[PDB]
Copies of this chain bind each other. A is one copy, B any other.
Amino acid sequence: SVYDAAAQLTADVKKDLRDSWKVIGSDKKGNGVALMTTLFADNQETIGYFKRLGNVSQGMANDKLRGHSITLMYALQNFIDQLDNPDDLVCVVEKFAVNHITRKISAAEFGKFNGPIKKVLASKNFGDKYANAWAKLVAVVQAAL
């Protein structure tokens, strides 16, 4: 149950999520593109899902990839803002899941995003503890897929 997953977000986890987000969420365009590029670099098999974005190897220069990257960050912003109210976190997560389910994205595939997040966090000096906190937030979405 998505609600049960939301329980893993204890006070210390929510704190690490907010503190780290204050940084990685402060440069959505730069960090958003870094996440996407890292995803394509380490998981080439996921490139096929984003054919609409054109040539993703262009990075920042690709307007379509840039628009998708910036927008992706606002979905994370939404999750972070709803942390203190499980009911709101749950309804936004389920809404979010709808489009991804239609694209046939399984819970395991979605889990591939954990790697990119871990590296982006590290680039900002946030270690394993923070990556584990984010893995738990990602787990909430997986509970809905």
Chain A residues bordering chain B, tally (CB within 8 A) = 27
Answer whether residue A92 sits at the interface, using C-beta atoms and an 8 A cutoff. yes
Chain copies in complex? 2
How far apart sit A71 and B75, CA to CA, in the bound complex (Å)? 8
Residues of chain B with a CB closer than 8 A to A29's CB: 88
Answer whether residue A91 sits at the interface, using C-beta atoms and an 8 A cutoff. yes
Q: List 26 A-B contacts (CB under 8 A).
A: A28-B81, A52-B98, A63-B87, A63-B90, A63-B91, A63-B94, A64-B91, A64-B94, A64-B95, A66-B88, A66-B91, A67-B88, A67-B91, A67-B92, A67-B95, A68-B95, A70-B78, A70-B82, A70-B88, A70-B91, A70-B92, A71-B78, A71-B95, A74-B74, A77-B77, A99-B99
